[PDB]
Design a protein around this ligand. Sequence first.
Ligand SMILES: CC(C)CCC[C@@H](C)[C@H]1CC[C@H]2[C@@H]3CC=C4C[C@@H](OC(=O)CCC(=O)O)CC[C@]4(C)[C@H]3CC[C@]12C
Ligand SMILES: CC(C)CCC[C@@H](C)[C@H]1CC[C@H]2[C@@H]3CC=C4C[C@@H](OC(=O)CCC(=O)O)CC[C@]4(C)[C@H]3CC[C@]12C
Ligand SMILES: CC(C)CCC[C@@H](C)[C@H]1CC[C@H]2[C@@H]3CC=C4C[C@@H](OC(=O)CCC(=O)O)CC[C@]4(C)[C@H]3CC[C@]12C
Ligand SMILES: CC(C)CCC[C@@H](C)[C@H]1CC[C@H]2[C@@H]3CC=C4C[C@@H](OC(=O)CCC(=O)O)CC[C@]4(C)[C@H]3CC[C@]12C
Ligand SMILES: CC(C)CCC[C@@H](C)[C@H]1CC[C@H]2[C@@H]3CC=C4C[C@@H](OC(=O)CCC(=O)O)CC[C@]4(C)[C@H]3CC[C@]12C
Ligand SMILES: CC(C)CCC[C@@H](C)[C@H]1CC[C@H]2[C@@H]3CC=C4C[C@@H](OC(=O)CCC(=O)O)CC[C@]4(C)[C@H]3CC[C@]12C
Ligand SMILES: [Ca+2]
Lengths: 81, 592, 162
Amino acid sequence: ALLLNRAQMAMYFWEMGSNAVSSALGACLLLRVMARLEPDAEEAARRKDLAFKFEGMGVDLFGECYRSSEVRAARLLLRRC
Amino acid sequence: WNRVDIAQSELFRGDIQWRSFHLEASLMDALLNDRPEFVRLLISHGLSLGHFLTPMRLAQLYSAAPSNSLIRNLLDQASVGHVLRMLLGPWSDLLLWALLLNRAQMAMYFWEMGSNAVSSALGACLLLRVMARLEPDAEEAARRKDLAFKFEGMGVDLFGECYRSSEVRAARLLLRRCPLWGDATCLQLAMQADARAFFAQDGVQSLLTQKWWGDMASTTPIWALVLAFFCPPLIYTRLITFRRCLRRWFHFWGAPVTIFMGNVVSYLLFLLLFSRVLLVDFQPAPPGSLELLLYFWAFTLLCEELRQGLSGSGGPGPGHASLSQRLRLYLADSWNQCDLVALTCFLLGVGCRLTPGLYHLGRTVLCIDFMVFTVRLLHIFTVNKQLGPKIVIVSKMMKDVFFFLFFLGVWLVAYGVATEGLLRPRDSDFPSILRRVFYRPYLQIFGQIPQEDMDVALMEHSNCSSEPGFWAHPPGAQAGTCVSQYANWLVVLLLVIFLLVANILLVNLLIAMFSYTFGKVQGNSDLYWKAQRYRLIREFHSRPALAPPFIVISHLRLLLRQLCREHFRVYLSKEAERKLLTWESVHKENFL
Amino acid sequence: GRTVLCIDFMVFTVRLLHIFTVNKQLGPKIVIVSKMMKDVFFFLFFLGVWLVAYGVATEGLLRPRDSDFPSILRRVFYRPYLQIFGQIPQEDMDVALMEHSNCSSEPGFWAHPPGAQAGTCVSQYANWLVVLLLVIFLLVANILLVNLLIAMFSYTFGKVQG
Ligand SMILES: CC(C)CCC[C@@H](C)[C@H]1CC[C@H]2[C@@H]3CC=C4C[C@@H](OC(=O)CCC(=O)O)CC[C@]4(C)[C@H]3CC[C@]12C
Ligand SMILES: CC(C)CCC[C@@H](C)[C@H]1CC[C@H]2[C@@H]3CC=C4C[C@@H](OC(=O)CCC(=O)O)CC[C@]4(C)[C@H]3CC[C@]12C
Ligand SMILES: CC(C)CCC[C@@H](C)[C@H]1CC[C@H]2[C@@H]3CC=C4C[C@@H](OC(=O)CCC(=O)O)CC[C@]4(C)[C@H]3CC[C@]12C
Ligand SMILES: CC(C)CCC[C@@H](C)[C@H]1CC[C@H]2[C@@H]3CC=C4C[C@@H](OC(=O)CCC(=O)O)CC[C@]4(C)[C@H]3CC[C@]12C
Ligand SMILES: CC(C)CCC[C@@H](C)[C@H]1CC[C@H]2[C@@H]3CC=C4C[C@@H](OC(=O)CCC(=O)O)CC[C@]4(C)[C@H]3CC[C@]12C
Ligand SMILES: CC(C)CCC[C@@H](C)[C@H]1CC[C@H]2[C@@H]3CC=C4C[C@@H](OC(=O)CCC(=O)O)CC[C@]4(C)[C@H]3CC[C@]12C
Ligand SMILES: [Ca+2]
């Protein structure tokens, strides 16, 4: 759903899987890369907007996990993904 | 009855067999009586508008204008001013009508049902600012100007959608040859409308850079233009990209950034020639090589000054042809006023130079004349995106400088006379009294504090006057021959109060005044600079490619044109032109 | 080789800034001072235009007799630039503060400034103006330009801080 720029599908498939923080950062990694690999800049506006929406959820979900346990959310970043 | 809920259920239900003429005269009373919500219903169920807008019914529509209007009499006066000579008694004429009679919601709807969304939104803004100036009373002009902002809203909002859709295909929206108004352009429409909000948006501003760098790929760097200006061989190279090698030459030297840089290089060389005349080639001999080259240079500067004068909307219309408007609008630009003060006291400085008696006055006028030509360096670089919005700021700061200069000058009189009165010099000439009162205290603001000239405990030789009292000799040249030492505890105290008020209270409160009004005017003067920008882009695009010293080639080409006897618009085919308006009427409907 | 190494010390010392940008206390403020360059360059534009305007008009009004191009480009640029920082040489520009008023066989009245690079003798024709034209300089540069640069720094520090 990230590849075909299906916004609400990717926003839902992130919610039903494991690896919330890494795939929110992973979704942000693809959509900034794949906008540079995109020829036309019209759909790249939707490609970059949906990258900010995963930037919202990764920041929002990690800030919950960090205020829960600063030790156990430290291990969230430095996990060998 | 002005009851909408009846009119829907009558037309939506109840054996729906409405014919033509049942709807035709129904929309008349929907238009003659104001009632715009009934109008949207009938157009939603569809009318002809090619069998509805028969010219009797339009004359019928204008006949129901109110008698005590600024329109009915304006028709009877005629029975913007060219609209009067054009309007007499399918949507564009109908949109024109609702603007004329200030019918707000009717015009807001007729804009939505027609073609040409961006040009008629700018066109509606053009009329309602013009027709408010043509309106006698200012009560309804508040509604006339408010409904002009509502079309300013929709033109900015709809173009920003069209620009983010396709920056190329919305670039063609502006520079389309609009066959209304005698082949008008939507940027020209936005200039004449004084559409500051329309120029301020990032689509038009990015379009202005592409017009600025005309056929030279506006993302090109600046140093490559400098490298290609001073190497015209380097024009045809791996640097600056563009979109017959002779048109390739003319796309460079006809582009407005190179006409600008030509005008900048040739003006920095004018000021370098002016200075080398003024500093090292200005003996009382008759004028030599470079001084006569300066006089011809400033003639061309004057011949280039009349080109803007006799080649010059919130005012008159284009092509006025009577010079009591064209020269009056020339001597209203604040730059021309600087350009003519420079060229008239160059003429004074040369006329006083050539006469034998007035030579030192001719030099003195030319030194101040360099000052005025150099300040014209500021007006040139206000087209720059990096410098320009900040040059326009520093004139908004003058209202605070003048407060400072008031508050300081009052305090400088107060300090300066009290100090000159307490220590009484014996060399009290009026040039020297007005110097120790004003000039010497003014310099104490800048760290020039002459303690040895005001404080007696720092000066020796305490017997220098036969007048009664005790005296002391200040070692300064214009400090008086000897000053009094009666109350020099006070003069030293009164300096302390001066440096507190001037150097600390006044200077740091001026920074608070600059920092405040920089915060206010930053938004509005950038908004003003955006709209000013296109006025300066096409002011270089219309200017000849040859600069000031070599402009006489392009004036002996223009004058030889008359013995033998910038309107920007990109050209495209009508089928590619209707594809543009079809694309754009979709994005109006997708926006509404 | 010595001269290049003295400028080379300058460049190695500025690399001291790039090192301490990892600091939490200093670092966010080192990254600010490069955002300020767009306002320095306006100031440096507006001053430099006014420094040409003041500097040539002053060097034209008082005409020195030691008008070499290094010294002309010094009394035009360097000496007015230093007046922004409180180095105002009144004795070199104002004739009423200098004695020895017969120092040139050229026609007109002259006067000797005691400065080393102030010219051998300057003119005293319109030195009411040079003194006035200094007053306008210190108003534009030292007060209008400097305090408007603070307003420009205080504004763009507010924008770029976040
Ligand atoms: C009095 C002196 C300075 C005589 C002039 C010497 C010239 C041969 C040269 C030396 C370097 C040149 C400058 C190199 C950089 C450019 C940037 C250029 O800016 C632009 O045109 C593009 C910016 C924009 O988009 O508005 C203006 C000309 C300018 C100052 C050139 C102007 C003339 C200069 C000063
Ligand atoms: C009491 C003594 C100091 C005499 C008073 C002199 C000042 C009232 C005048 C003389 C020269 C003026 C300056 C000449 C150069 C200009 C550039 C000007 O900027 C522009 O013209 C930009 C063009 C534009 O924004 O339209 C802003 C004011 C300023 C600094 C002026 C500020 C006020 C000054 C100092
Ligand atoms: C900036 C605001 C707060 C007001 C400050 C005004 C002064 C800085 C100006 C207005 C009156 C001027 C002066 C009028 C009288 C003289 C004496 C004059 O000395 C001479 O005797 C030489 C020839 C002459 O003018 O008689 C030199 C210029 C000077 C200081 C003028 C230059 C600077 C002055 C003091
Ligand atoms: C040219 C001179 C200064 C020769 C150097 C003499 C050194 C033997 C010593 C004297 C005191 C020392 C300083 C004492 C305090 C520290 C703080 C330290 O900052 C950090 O590493 C932690 C801050 C952060 O978390 O980023 C950097 C080194 C420094 C400046 C030391 C650097 C080397 C210094 C100057
Ligand atoms: C017309 C005359 C004055 C010659 C013009 C010289 C200036 C245009 C240049 C030469 C040295 C420069 C300075 C050298 C040291 C730097 C540090 C620099 O900060 C950083 O590099 C931080 C690193 C980063 O933020 O990426 C900010 C600009 C600054 C002050 C420069 C400001 C502009 C300067 C004065
Ligand atoms: C900061 C902005 C507003 C522009 C200011 C530029 C000046 C401060 C710079 C550019 C030209 C420079 C000068 C070019 C000519 C000279 C004369 C020179 O005196 C000499 O004769 C010694 C040897 C020589 O250079 O010939 C000493 C350096 C100096 C002042 C240079 C140092 C400072 C100057 C005046
Ligand atoms: Ca002009």
